[PDB]
Scaffold this active site. Structure first.
Site, PDB file in Angstrom:
ATOM      1  N   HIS D  30       1.018  -1.309   0.123  1.00 33.37           N
ATOM      2  CA  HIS D  30       0.233   0.138   0.099  1.00 33.37           C
ATOM      3  C   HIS D  30       0.828   1.330   0.061  1.00 33.37           C
ATOM      4  O   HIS D  30       0.214   2.146  -0.463  1.00 33.37           O
ATOM      5  CB  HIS D  30      -0.890  -0.059   1.073  1.00 33.37           C
ATOM      6  CG  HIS D  30      -0.093   0.050   2.423  1.00 33.37           C
ATOM      7  ND1 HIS D  30       0.491  -0.896   2.954  1.00 33.37           N
ATOM      8  CD2 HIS D  30       0.039   1.161   3.378  1.00 33.37           C
ATOM      9  CE1 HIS D  30       0.799  -0.673   4.185  1.00 33.37           C
ATOM     10  NE2 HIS D  30       0.761   0.773   4.380  1.00 33.37           N
ATOM     11  N   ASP D  52      -0.322  -7.823   1.243  1.00 32.23           N
ATOM     12  CA  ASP D  52      -0.287  -6.272   1.115  1.00 32.23           C
ATOM     13  C   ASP D  52       1.221  -6.028   1.268  1.00 32.23           C
ATOM     14  O   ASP D  52       1.722  -4.889   2.054  1.00 32.23           O
ATOM     15  CB  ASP D  52      -0.873  -5.348   2.138  1.00 32.23           C
ATOM     16  CG  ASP D  52      -1.135  -4.067   1.933  1.00 32.23           C
ATOM     17  OD1 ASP D  52      -0.892  -3.546   0.604  1.00 32.23           O
ATOM     18  OD2 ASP D  52      -1.655  -3.102   2.538  1.00 32.23           O
ATOM     19  N   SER D 104       4.332   2.919   8.217  1.00 32.01           N
ATOM     20  CA  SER D 104       4.078   1.506   7.547  1.00 32.01           C
ATOM     21  C   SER D 104       5.526   1.042   7.499  1.00 32.01           C
ATOM     22  O   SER D 104       6.373   1.849   6.867  1.00 32.01           O
ATOM     23  CB  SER D 104       3.073   1.396   6.495  1.00 32.01           C
ATOM     24  OG  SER D 104       1.857   1.771   7.087  1.00 32.01           O
TER      25      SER D 104
END
Lengths: 153, 51, 153, 153
Positions: D30, D52, D104
Site C-alpha cells: 500500500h 499487502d 508503515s
C-alpha cells in the site's frame, strides 16, 4: 539565502540561483542549466518571456519554506548575498565590479528577510553598477526594471 | 470543390489566428498578476478568455 | 591525489579510477562504469584498444589544473595509493598481496608529485607482485608493460 | 535498526520503511515510493497482494547484513523505533496517539535485537491503539494480524 536558494547546474558550473517565493519558483529565461533539486526538476515552468522568467508551483512539502514577496521599498540600503545594495531614484545600484554572470536569480533582501527584487543583470555606468531587476508595485504588479545598457548575467 | 475548400481553409485560418491572439492576450494580461500576491483582477478578461 | 583522481563507479560499487594528466583524461578500457563528473561523462573518448585505454580532452575550465607527467624513471621506491612501489629492471614490483580488483587506473606518482605510469593489473611473482602498467619513454613514447601472467584488475 | 532500516521516498518524503530480514527485502504494498538504497532499487519485487507486502532477494553483499527473525513471543513489552509496544491478548498495542501515516513497514524488535513483526497500520479503541501488523507463528506461519477498523499507515 543559503537554505532556500537552489543553484542551477550545468557542465559542472553554476549558472544562476532559482528562488521560491510565495509558493512559486522563478528562474531567468535567458539562463540555461539544470536545477539540483530533483523536486524542482519535476515542476513545469510556464514562461513569461516579456519578463524574462519562468515560474512553476512548488510541491506540497516545500510550500511552507519560501521567501516573502513585498511591496514597500523605501530608498536606502538593502541586503544581498554579496553585501548591501543601494536603492535611489527608483533604481538599484551596487559597487562597481561586484557580481556577474552566474549570479542571475539572486534575490535582493530586505531587513526582515523579505525579497525586494530578483537580479537579472547589471549595467556598468562607470562609478557604480546599475541592477536590471524585477520589482513589485503598490498595486501588486511585478515590474521588470532594467536600466539602459543592462547586461543579462 | 475548390471554392468550398477555400472557404473552409479561410475559416480555419481565421479561427486559428483568433485563438492564438486570444491566448497571447491572456498570457500578457495575466502573467504579471500570477507572479504576485493578491491578484485583484477585473474578472471580465478571465471570464471572456477562460473558455 | 584525492582532489584530481576520480573513482569509477558501477552498480553502486567503485570498480576503477580515471585519471587526468597533461590536460587529458584517461580511463582503463577493461573496466565498465560511469564517471560521476558531468564534463568527463560528456567528453568524447577516443579508444586505443591495444593500449587498453581511452583518452579525452579535458574541458577548458579545469585544463589549467591537471596532473603533470614525466618520462624520467630513476630506479628505487615510488609512492602510490597503497604505499610504495619498487621500480627495478624495467618492472614495477610491489609487496605480495597488496592490491587487487578495483585498483586499476590508479596513477603511480613521483616524489615530486609527477605521474609516471598507470597501473592496469598485477601478477604475484611469489614474494612480491609485478604490476602491469603503461610506462612512457624518453622519445615521446608510451609503452604498455604486461608481465607474463598479468591479471587485469 | 538505523543501518538496516531504510526510508522510502515519495516525492522526496518518507512514507514508509523497508526492512531487510534474513537476506530478503520486504516493502509494504500500500505504501508507494522509491527505496533510498540504489542497490535495493535494482531488486525485482514479487507481490503477495493478499498480505499487502512485496518481498525480494537482497543482493549478496547484504545477505549477511540483515535483521534476524524470531518466533518466540511471550506476552509483554517489546521494542520499537518510537518506544515500546505491548503484545497482549495476542495483540500488538501502543499508547493511543503515537504513530500514524508513513510509519508503515517499521520493524518491531526483540530485546536481543531480533525482529518479531512488521507494522502495517493501526486502529484506535480510545484507550489504546491496536496495530495491524504481520506476526509469525510457532509453526513458522505468518498471519497478517489486522484488528477491526485497521487503517494502513
Amino acid at each position: 539565502e543559503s537554505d532556500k536558494t537552489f543553484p542551477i547546474m550545468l557542465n559542472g558550473q553554476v549558472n544562476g540561483y532559482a528562488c521560491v517565493v510565495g509558493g512559486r519558483l522563478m528562474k531567468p529565461l535567458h539562463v540555461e542549466g539544470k536545477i539540483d533539486n530533483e523536486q524542482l526538476a519535476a515542476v513545469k515552468l510556464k514562461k513569461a518571456s516579456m519578463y524574462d522568467l519562468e515560474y512553476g508551483d512548488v510541491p506540497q512539502n516545500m510550500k511552507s519554506d519560501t521567501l516573502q514577496y513585498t511591496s514597500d521599498k523605501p530608498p536606502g540600503f538593502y541586503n544581498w548575498h554579496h553585501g548591501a545594495v543601494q536603492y535611489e531614484n527608483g533604481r538599484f545600484t551596487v559597487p562597481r565590479g561586484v557580481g556577474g554572470k552566474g549570479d542571475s536569480g539572486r534575490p535582493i533582501l530586505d531587513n526582515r528577510g523579505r525579497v525586494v527584487a530578483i537580479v537579472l543583470g547589471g549595467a556598468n555606468e562607470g562609478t557604480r553598477t546599475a541592477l536590471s531587476v524585477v520589482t513589485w508595485n503598490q498595486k501588486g504588479v511585478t515590474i521588470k526594471d532594467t536600466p539602459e545598457g543592462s547586461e543579462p548575467w | 470543390v475548390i471554392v468550398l475548400c477555400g472557404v473552409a481553409l479561410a475559416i480555419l485560418v481565421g479561427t486559428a489566428s483568433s485563438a492564438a491572439c486570444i491566448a497571447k492576450a491572456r498570457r500578457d494580461c495575466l502573467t504579471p498578476y500570477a507572479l504576485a500576491p493578491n491578484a485583484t483582477v477585473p474578472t471580465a478578461l478571465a471570464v471572456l478568455c477562460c473558455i
